[PDB]
Coordinates of C-alpha atoms and ligand atoms in Angstrom, one line a residue:
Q1 CA 49.0 53.2 -13.7
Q2 CA 48.7 57.0 -14.6
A3 CA 48.2 57.0 -18.4
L4 CA 44.4 56.4 -18.4
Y5 CA 42.1 59.0 -20.1
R6 CA 38.5 58.5 -19.3
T7 CA 35.2 60.1 -20.3
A8 CA 31.6 59.9 -19.6
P9 CA 26.6 59.7 -24.6
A10 CA 23.0 59.5 -25.9
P11 CA 22.5 56.7 -28.4
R12 CA 21.0 57.3 -31.8
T13 CA 21.4 56.8 -35.6
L14 CA 22.7 58.9 -38.3
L15 CA 19.1 59.3 -39.7
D16 CA 18.2 60.7 -36.3
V17 CA 21.0 63.3 -36.7
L18 CA 19.9 64.3 -40.3
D19 CA 16.4 64.3 -39.3
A20 CA 16.9 66.5 -36.3
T21 CA 18.8 69.0 -38.4
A22 CA 16.3 68.9 -41.2
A23 CA 13.5 69.7 -38.6
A24 CA 15.5 72.6 -37.2
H25 CA 16.8 74.0 -40.5
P26 CA 14.4 72.9 -43.2
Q27 CA 15.3 75.8 -45.5
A28 CA 19.1 75.8 -44.9
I29 CA 21.3 74.6 -47.9
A30 CA 22.3 71.1 -47.1
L31 CA 24.2 70.2 -50.2
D32 CA 25.6 72.4 -53.1
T33 CA 27.4 71.3 -56.2
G34 CA 26.8 74.3 -58.3
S35 CA 24.3 72.4 -60.7
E36 CA 22.1 71.3 -57.7
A37 CA 21.7 73.3 -54.4
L38 CA 19.4 71.4 -52.0
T39 CA 17.7 72.7 -48.9
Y40 CA 17.5 70.3 -45.9
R41 CA 13.9 69.7 -46.8
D42 CA 14.6 69.0 -50.5
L43 CA 17.6 66.8 -49.6
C44 CA 15.3 64.6 -47.5
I45 CA 12.8 64.4 -50.4
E46 CA 15.6 63.5 -52.9
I47 CA 17.0 60.9 -50.5
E48 CA 13.6 59.3 -49.9
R49 CA 12.9 59.0 -53.6
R50 CA 16.4 57.2 -53.9
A51 CA 15.8 55.0 -50.9
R52 CA 12.4 54.0 -52.1
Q53 CA 14.2 52.4 -55.2
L54 CA 16.5 50.5 -52.9
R55 CA 13.6 49.2 -50.7
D56 CA 11.7 48.2 -53.9
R57 CA 14.8 45.9 -54.5
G58 CA 14.4 44.5 -51.0
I59 CA 17.3 46.5 -49.5
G60 CA 17.0 47.1 -45.8
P61 CA 18.6 46.5 -42.3
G62 CA 21.0 43.6 -42.4
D63 CA 22.1 44.4 -46.1
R64 CA 25.2 45.8 -47.5
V65 CA 25.2 48.1 -50.6
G66 CA 28.3 49.1 -52.4
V67 CA 28.8 52.6 -53.6
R68 CA 31.1 53.5 -56.5
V69 CA 30.3 56.9 -57.7
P70 CA 32.7 59.7 -58.8
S71 CA 33.9 62.2 -56.3
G72 CA 32.7 65.8 -56.4
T73 CA 29.1 64.8 -57.5
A74 CA 25.9 65.4 -55.8
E75 CA 24.8 61.9 -56.5
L76 CA 27.7 60.4 -54.6
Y77 CA 26.5 61.9 -51.4
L78 CA 22.8 61.4 -52.2
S79 CA 23.5 57.7 -52.9
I80 CA 25.3 57.2 -49.5
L81 CA 22.4 59.0 -47.6
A82 CA 19.9 56.9 -49.7
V83 CA 21.5 53.7 -48.6
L84 CA 21.5 54.9 -45.0
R85 CA 17.8 56.0 -45.2
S86 CA 16.8 52.5 -46.3
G87 CA 18.2 51.0 -43.3
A88 CA 21.1 49.2 -45.0
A89 CA 24.9 49.9 -44.6
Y90 CA 27.0 51.4 -47.4
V91 CA 30.3 50.1 -48.5
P92 CA 32.3 52.8 -50.4
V93 CA 34.9 52.3 -53.0
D94 CA 36.4 55.2 -54.6
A95 CA 35.5 55.5 -58.2
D96 CA 39.1 56.2 -59.3
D97 CA 40.4 53.1 -57.4
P98 CA 41.2 50.1 -59.7
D99 CA 38.4 47.9 -60.6
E100 CA 40.4 44.9 -59.0
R101 CA 40.3 46.6 -55.6
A102 CA 36.6 47.4 -56.2
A103 CA 35.6 43.7 -56.8
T104 CA 37.7 42.5 -53.9
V105 CA 36.0 44.8 -51.3
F106 CA 32.5 44.2 -52.7
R107 CA 33.0 40.4 -52.8
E108 CA 34.6 40.6 -49.3
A109 CA 31.7 42.7 -47.9
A110 CA 29.1 40.4 -49.5
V111 CA 27.2 43.3 -50.8
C112 CA 23.8 42.7 -52.3
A113 CA 24.2 45.6 -54.9
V114 CA 26.5 48.4 -55.9
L115 CA 25.3 51.8 -57.0
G116 CA 27.4 52.6 -60.0
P117 CA 27.5 56.0 -62.0
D118 CA 24.6 55.0 -64.2
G119 CA 22.4 53.1 -61.8
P120 CA 22.3 49.9 -59.6
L121 CA 24.3 46.9 -60.5
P122 CA 24.3 43.4 -59.1
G123 CA 26.0 42.3 -55.8
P124 CA 27.3 38.7 -55.0
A125 CA 24.6 38.5 -52.3
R126 CA 20.8 38.8 -52.2
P127 CA 18.9 41.4 -50.2
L128 CA 17.1 40.3 -47.1
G129 CA 13.9 42.2 -47.3
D130 CA 13.7 43.6 -43.8
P131 CA 11.2 46.5 -44.0
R132 CA 12.4 48.1 -40.7
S133 CA 14.4 51.3 -40.5
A134 CA 17.8 51.4 -39.0
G135 CA 18.3 51.2 -35.3
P136 CA 21.6 52.2 -33.4
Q137 CA 22.6 48.5 -33.5
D138 CA 22.4 48.3 -37.2
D139 CA 25.5 48.8 -39.3
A140 CA 26.0 52.3 -40.9
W141 CA 29.1 51.6 -43.0
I142 CA 31.7 49.1 -43.7
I143 CA 35.0 50.7 -44.6
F144 CA 38.2 48.8 -45.5
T145 CA 41.4 49.8 -43.8
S146 CA 44.6 48.9 -45.7
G147 CA 46.4 47.5 -42.5
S148 CA 50.0 47.3 -41.7
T149 CA 51.5 44.2 -43.5
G150 CA 48.4 42.3 -44.9
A151 CA 45.7 43.1 -47.2
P152 CA 42.9 45.6 -46.3
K153 CA 40.2 44.3 -44.0
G154 CA 36.6 45.4 -43.5
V155 CA 35.5 47.4 -40.5
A156 CA 31.9 47.4 -39.8
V157 CA 30.6 50.3 -37.7
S158 CA 27.3 50.7 -36.0
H159 CA 24.9 53.7 -36.3
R160 CA 25.4 54.0 -32.4
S161 CA 29.1 54.3 -32.8
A162 CA 28.9 56.7 -36.0
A163 CA 26.3 58.9 -34.2
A164 CA 28.4 58.9 -31.0
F165 CA 31.4 60.1 -33.0
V166 CA 29.4 62.8 -34.6
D167 CA 27.9 64.0 -31.4
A168 CA 31.2 63.9 -29.7
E169 CA 32.7 66.3 -32.2
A170 CA 29.7 68.6 -31.5
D171 CA 31.3 69.3 -28.1
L172 CA 34.6 69.8 -29.5
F173 CA 35.1 72.3 -32.5
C174 CA 34.3 75.9 -32.3
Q175 CA 32.6 75.9 -29.0
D176 CA 32.7 79.8 -29.0
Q177 CA 30.9 80.1 -32.5
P178 CA 29.2 76.8 -33.2
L179 CA 29.0 75.3 -36.7
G180 CA 25.7 76.2 -38.3
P181 CA 23.8 77.6 -41.2
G182 CA 26.3 80.0 -43.1
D183 CA 29.1 77.5 -42.8
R184 CA 30.1 75.7 -45.8
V185 CA 32.0 72.5 -45.6
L186 CA 34.4 71.0 -48.2
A187 CA 33.9 67.3 -49.0
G188 CA 37.2 66.5 -50.8
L189 CA 38.1 63.3 -49.0
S190 CA 37.6 59.8 -50.7
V191 CA 34.4 58.2 -49.4
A192 CA 36.5 55.0 -49.0
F193 CA 38.4 56.8 -46.2
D194 CA 36.3 57.3 -43.1
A195 CA 37.6 60.9 -42.5
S196 CA 35.0 61.7 -45.4
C197 CA 32.3 60.8 -42.6
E198 CA 33.8 63.7 -40.6
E199 CA 33.3 65.9 -43.6
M200 CA 29.8 64.9 -44.4
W201 CA 28.4 65.3 -40.8
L202 CA 30.4 68.6 -40.0
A203 CA 27.7 69.8 -42.4
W204 CA 24.7 67.7 -41.7
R205 CA 25.0 67.6 -37.9
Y206 CA 24.6 71.4 -37.6
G207 CA 22.6 72.7 -40.5
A208 CA 25.7 73.8 -42.4
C209 CA 26.2 73.1 -46.1
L210 CA 28.2 70.3 -47.7
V211 CA 30.3 71.5 -50.8
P212 CA 31.7 68.5 -52.6
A213 CA 34.9 68.8 -54.8
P214 CA 36.4 66.2 -57.1
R215 CA 39.5 64.4 -55.7
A216 CA 41.7 65.7 -58.4
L217 CA 41.0 69.3 -57.5
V218 CA 42.1 68.6 -53.9
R219 CA 45.5 67.4 -55.3
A220 CA 46.0 70.5 -57.5
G221 CA 46.7 73.3 -55.1
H222 CA 46.8 76.2 -57.6
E223 CA 43.3 75.4 -58.9
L224 CA 41.8 74.6 -55.4
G225 CA 42.5 77.9 -53.8
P226 CA 40.5 80.1 -56.1
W227 CA 37.7 77.4 -56.1
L228 CA 37.5 77.4 -52.2
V229 CA 37.3 81.3 -52.2
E230 CA 34.5 81.2 -54.9
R231 CA 32.6 78.5 -53.0
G232 CA 32.9 80.4 -49.7
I233 CA 34.3 77.4 -47.9
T234 CA 34.7 77.9 -44.1
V235 CA 35.5 74.3 -43.0
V236 CA 38.2 72.0 -44.2
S237 CA 39.1 68.5 -43.1
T238 CA 42.1 67.1 -44.7
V239 CA 45.2 65.0 -44.4
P240 CA 48.8 66.5 -43.9
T241 CA 50.4 65.4 -47.1
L242 CA 47.5 66.9 -49.0
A243 CA 47.4 70.2 -47.2
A244 CA 51.3 70.3 -47.3
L245 CA 51.3 70.9 -51.1
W246 CA 48.4 73.5 -50.9
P247 CA 49.2 77.1 -51.7
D248 CA 49.8 78.9 -48.4
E249 CA 46.9 81.3 -48.7
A250 CA 44.5 78.6 -50.0
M251 CA 42.8 78.6 -46.6
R252 CA 41.9 82.3 -46.4
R253 CA 38.3 82.6 -44.8
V254 CA 38.6 79.0 -43.6
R255 CA 37.7 79.2 -39.9
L256 CA 38.0 75.6 -38.9
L257 CA 40.9 73.5 -40.2
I258 CA 41.1 69.8 -39.1
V259 CA 44.0 67.4 -40.0
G260 CA 44.1 63.7 -39.3
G261 CA 45.3 60.2 -40.5
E262 CA 49.1 60.8 -40.2
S263 CA 51.4 62.8 -38.3
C264 CA 50.9 66.7 -38.6
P265 CA 54.3 68.4 -39.3
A266 CA 55.2 71.2 -37.0
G267 CA 55.3 73.6 -40.0
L268 CA 51.7 73.1 -40.9
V269 CA 50.8 74.6 -37.5
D270 CA 53.0 77.5 -38.3
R271 CA 51.4 78.0 -41.5
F272 CA 47.6 77.9 -40.5
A273 CA 47.1 78.2 -36.7
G274 CA 46.3 81.5 -35.0
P275 CA 43.5 83.8 -34.0
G276 CA 40.4 83.5 -36.3
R277 CA 41.1 79.8 -37.3
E278 CA 40.7 76.8 -35.0
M279 CA 43.3 74.2 -36.3
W280 CA 42.7 70.8 -34.7
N281 CA 44.7 67.5 -34.8
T282 CA 42.6 64.5 -34.9
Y283 CA 43.9 60.8 -34.4
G284 CA 41.9 57.6 -34.7
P285 CA 41.9 54.1 -36.4
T286 CA 39.0 53.1 -38.6
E287 CA 38.5 50.4 -36.0
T288 CA 37.2 52.9 -33.2
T289 CA 35.1 55.1 -35.6
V290 CA 37.0 58.0 -37.4
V291 CA 38.4 59.9 -34.4
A292 CA 39.4 58.7 -31.0
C293 CA 41.3 61.9 -29.6
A294 CA 42.0 65.5 -30.8
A295 CA 44.0 68.6 -29.7
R296 CA 43.8 72.2 -30.7
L297 CA 47.0 73.1 -32.6
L298 CA 48.6 76.4 -31.4
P299 CA 51.8 78.0 -32.3
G300 CA 54.7 77.5 -29.8
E301 CA 53.0 74.2 -28.7
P302 CA 54.2 70.7 -29.5
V303 CA 52.0 68.8 -31.9
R304 CA 49.7 66.6 -29.8
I305 CA 47.1 64.1 -30.9
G306 CA 45.4 65.0 -27.6
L307 CA 42.6 63.9 -25.5
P308 CA 39.7 61.4 -26.0
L309 CA 36.3 62.2 -27.5
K310 CA 33.3 62.0 -25.3
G311 CA 32.7 58.2 -25.0
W312 CA 36.3 57.0 -25.8
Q313 CA 38.7 55.7 -23.3
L314 CA 42.5 55.6 -23.7
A315 CA 45.2 53.6 -22.0
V316 CA 49.0 53.6 -22.7
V317 CA 50.6 50.4 -21.6
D318 CA 54.0 48.7 -21.6
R319 CA 54.8 45.2 -22.9
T320 CA 53.5 43.7 -19.7
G321 CA 50.1 45.4 -20.5
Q322 CA 50.2 47.7 -17.6
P323 CA 49.5 51.5 -17.8
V324 CA 52.7 53.6 -17.9
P325 CA 53.2 56.7 -16.0
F326 CA 53.0 60.2 -17.3
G327 CA 56.1 61.1 -19.3
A328 CA 56.6 57.6 -20.4
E329 CA 56.0 55.9 -23.8
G330 CA 53.7 52.9 -24.5
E331 CA 51.3 51.4 -26.9
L332 CA 47.8 53.0 -27.1
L333 CA 44.7 51.0 -26.4
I334 CA 41.1 52.3 -27.2
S335 CA 37.8 51.2 -25.7
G336 CA 34.4 52.8 -25.4
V337 CA 31.5 53.8 -27.6
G338 CA 33.5 53.9 -30.8
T339 CA 35.0 50.4 -30.8
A340 CA 33.8 48.7 -34.0
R341 CA 34.6 45.2 -35.4
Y342 CA 36.2 43.4 -38.2
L343 CA 34.0 41.4 -40.7
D344 CA 36.6 38.6 -40.4
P345 CA 36.1 36.8 -37.0
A346 CA 39.8 35.7 -37.0
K347 CA 41.0 39.2 -37.5
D348 CA 38.6 40.6 -34.8
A349 CA 39.9 38.0 -32.3
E350 CA 43.6 39.3 -32.6
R351 CA 42.9 43.0 -32.2
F352 CA 39.9 43.4 -30.0
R353 CA 40.4 41.7 -26.7
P354 CA 39.6 42.4 -23.0
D355 CA 42.2 44.4 -21.1
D356 CA 42.1 44.8 -17.4
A357 CA 43.8 48.2 -17.7
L358 CA 40.5 49.8 -19.1
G359 CA 38.1 47.2 -17.7
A360 CA 36.2 46.5 -20.9
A361 CA 35.5 43.4 -22.9
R362 CA 36.5 44.9 -26.3
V363 CA 39.6 47.0 -26.3
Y364 CA 41.3 47.9 -29.7
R365 CA 45.2 47.6 -29.6
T366 CA 46.2 50.2 -32.0
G367 CA 49.9 49.3 -32.7
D368 CA 50.9 53.0 -32.2
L369 CA 53.5 54.3 -29.8
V370 CA 52.5 57.5 -28.0
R371 CA 53.9 59.5 -25.1
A372 CA 51.4 60.2 -22.3
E373 CA 51.1 63.6 -20.7
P374 CA 48.2 64.9 -18.8
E375 CA 47.4 67.6 -21.2
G376 CA 47.4 65.3 -24.2
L377 CA 49.0 62.3 -25.9
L378 CA 51.9 62.8 -28.3
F379 CA 52.2 60.5 -31.3
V380 CA 55.6 58.6 -31.6
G381 CA 55.2 56.0 -34.3
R382 CA 54.7 52.3 -34.8
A383 CA 54.6 50.0 -31.8
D384 CA 55.2 46.8 -33.9
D385 CA 56.4 46.0 -37.4
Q386 CA 58.9 48.9 -37.1
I387 CA 60.9 49.8 -40.2
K388 CA 64.4 48.3 -40.3
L389 CA 67.5 49.8 -41.8
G390 CA 70.1 47.2 -42.0
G391 CA 69.1 45.4 -38.9
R392 CA 68.4 48.5 -36.9
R393 CA 64.8 49.4 -36.1
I394 CA 64.1 53.0 -37.0
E395 CA 61.2 55.4 -36.8
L396 CA 60.5 57.0 -40.1
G397 CA 58.6 59.8 -38.4
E398 CA 61.8 61.3 -37.0
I399 CA 63.3 61.4 -40.5
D400 CA 60.1 63.0 -41.9
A401 CA 60.4 65.7 -39.3
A402 CA 64.0 66.4 -39.9
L403 CA 63.3 66.7 -43.6
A404 CA 60.5 68.9 -43.2
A405 CA 62.5 71.2 -40.9
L406 CA 64.9 72.0 -43.6
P407 CA 64.9 75.5 -45.0
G408 CA 63.2 75.9 -48.3
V409 CA 61.2 72.6 -48.0
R410 CA 57.4 72.7 -48.0
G411 CA 57.0 68.9 -47.5
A412 CA 58.9 65.7 -47.2
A413 CA 58.7 61.9 -46.6
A414 CA 61.5 59.3 -46.0
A415 CA 61.6 55.8 -47.2
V416 CA 64.0 52.8 -46.8
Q417 CA 64.4 51.5 -50.2
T418 CA 66.0 48.2 -51.5
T419 CA 68.6 48.4 -54.3
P420 CA 68.4 46.1 -57.2
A421 CA 71.1 44.0 -55.8
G422 CA 69.3 43.8 -52.5
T423 CA 70.9 46.3 -50.1
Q424 CA 69.1 49.2 -48.4
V425 CA 69.1 53.0 -48.9
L426 CA 67.5 55.5 -46.7
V427 CA 66.1 58.2 -49.0
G428 CA 64.6 61.6 -48.1
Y429 CA 62.1 62.9 -50.6
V430 CA 61.7 66.8 -50.3
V431 CA 59.3 69.1 -52.3
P432 CA 61.1 72.5 -52.5
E433 CA 59.2 75.8 -52.1
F434 CA 66.6 75.0 -51.4
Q435 CA 70.3 73.9 -51.9
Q436 CA 71.0 70.3 -51.8
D437 CA 74.6 70.3 -50.7
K438 CA 73.6 72.6 -47.9
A439 CA 70.5 70.5 -46.8
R440 CA 72.7 67.5 -46.4
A441 CA 75.0 69.4 -44.2
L442 CA 72.2 70.3 -41.9
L443 CA 71.0 66.8 -41.8
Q444 CA 74.6 65.6 -40.9
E445 CA 74.5 68.2 -38.0
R446 CA 71.2 66.8 -36.7
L447 CA 71.1 63.1 -37.4
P448 CA 73.4 60.1 -36.7
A449 CA 75.3 59.4 -39.7
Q450 CA 73.4 56.1 -40.4
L451 CA 70.1 58.2 -40.4
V452 CA 71.2 60.9 -42.8
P453 CA 68.9 60.1 -45.9
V454 CA 69.9 60.4 -49.5
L455 CA 68.2 63.6 -50.8
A456 CA 65.9 63.6 -53.7
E457 CA 63.8 66.6 -54.9
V458 CA 60.3 65.9 -56.3
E459 CA 57.5 68.2 -57.3
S460 CA 55.1 66.7 -55.0
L461 CA 54.6 63.8 -52.8
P462 CA 52.4 61.0 -54.0
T463 CA 49.3 60.2 -52.0
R464 CA 47.2 57.1 -51.3
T465 CA 43.4 57.2 -51.9
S466 CA 43.0 58.3 -48.3
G467 CA 45.4 61.3 -48.9
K468 CA 48.1 60.0 -46.7
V469 CA 51.6 59.9 -48.2
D470 CA 52.2 56.9 -50.6
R471 CA 55.8 56.0 -49.7
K472 CA 55.8 53.0 -52.1
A473 CA 55.0 55.4 -54.8
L474 CA 57.9 57.7 -54.4
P475 CA 60.5 57.5 -57.2
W476 CA 63.2 54.8 -56.8
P477 CA 66.0 54.4 -57.9
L478 CA 66.6 58.1 -58.0
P479 CA 66.8 59.6 -61.6
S480 CA 69.0 62.6 -62.3
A481 CA 66.0 63.9 -64.6
Ligands
LIG1 N1 39.8 63.7 -39.2 C1 39.4 62.4 -39.5 C2 40.7 61.6 -39.3 C3 40.3 60.1 -39.3 C4 41.6 59.3 -39.6 C5 41.2 57.8 -39.9 N2 40.2 57.3 -38.9 C6 42.4 56.8 -39.9 O1 43.5 57.4 -40.1 O2 42.3 55.5 -39.8 P1 43.3 54.5 -40.5 O3 43.3 54.6 -42.0 O4 42.8 53.0 -40.3 O5 44.8 54.6 -39.8 C7 44.9 55.1 -38.5 C8 46.4 55.1 -38.3 O6 47.1 56.3 -38.9 C9 47.8 56.9 -38.0 N3 47.2 58.2 -37.7 C10 45.9 58.5 -37.7 N4 45.8 59.9 -37.4 C11 47.0 60.2 -36.9 C12 47.5 61.6 -36.4 N5 46.6 62.6 -36.2 N6 49.0 61.7 -36.2 C13 49.8 60.6 -36.4 N7 49.4 59.4 -36.9 C14 47.9 59.2 -37.1 C15 47.9 55.8 -36.8 O7 49.0 54.9 -37.1 C16 46.7 55.2 -36.8 O8 47.0 53.8 -36.3

């Protein structure tokens, strides 16, 4: 019973966080889109004018309000804050997602309204008219996580959890030179993906300024670089597949780089970590509020996912459910202040259960394999529903890493594909900065024959709405184009 990581946090709401910042930094720039540039004082005024409209419709605690507003716009973030201010919880769907996914989420969340680009629209449910403002027990957001084999499911996160996450991160990044007025935070992640909550509060927890960018820009590295320099961005939170394809010097003047959501390739550390830039790995399921553990990424060190945030508790366990010893691998379990819940009672019953190991009623079973060391966890891969090639269980991450390690490759992803006749091919998709016949030879020296993937060059790797790699979207079968 050695792989247990424990921690000791003051409960409050996200409105408490914003209002404390606004009180301390009333004249600092909170939100900056070029067109509009709002001090914290004017941000609150604009928030209140929008929240008043929602209250007039009866929206308050207990209500769920959809948000479907284009990225990179002031109104997107003003609308989210307006919902929170009114005491309701917001339910974000990316504007560029399909209308079909949007209808599913809003129906499944039972929203009483959705904020569209030209004003409020109807929601399947009706507001409940509670006049109170939110307390820590009230939901702040409901974010859908795609899952692992089924359809995406709604995760409801309380203000207490969301605030605990934001306050936890205030003890983590840049302790030597804290975030504050003068820092300028990119907001480029989809609001449907809860890492965008990290973006938002990396500004609003400290009196720094949020600088939204449209999602398309974040996927276009040659255009993003000049834009970040122009905007004076100092803080970037992103996803490895996105950043992999960015121009190397697209992070100059960025002093805090955070990656999360999928495995951070060793090469990204080599590209960005060093004196004058804190680079951090962050790991966490939507089910335990954005981030559960983090590690500084430094050159010459293995990539770790790290140690728990203040309020999170981690256990690594065998099949038996008992904690493994240091050096061993096991499934990661998470409890503490960040554990959320599923909307669907049945889904909640199978993922949140008591576990004697951590001694808590609600423990989230992540389904992730990790290796436990006293200085931090190392991510391994799936603990269940593992990819099969033929009949053999394989870990894609090891193939991803071997492809990324090739000379002349900026980014790579593997996939087990099914041929039209119904057999299987392991394919390695590679974005060259590269000689194919010579890359294959290197793969043959480092991988068992059955794990040497068929190589395919591609100009970029497709991403999901969150920014993680979209393996289903990689080209297949392989054109000679
Ligand atoms: N900076 C904020 C980051 C927040 C990430 C977000 N909460 C999230 O990813 O949540 P989900 O979209 O629900 O899926 C979580 C699952 O993705 C994998 N994962 C997340 N971070 C990872 C990391 N740093 N390294 C390797 N794998 C990671 C895990 O399989 C994890 O179960």
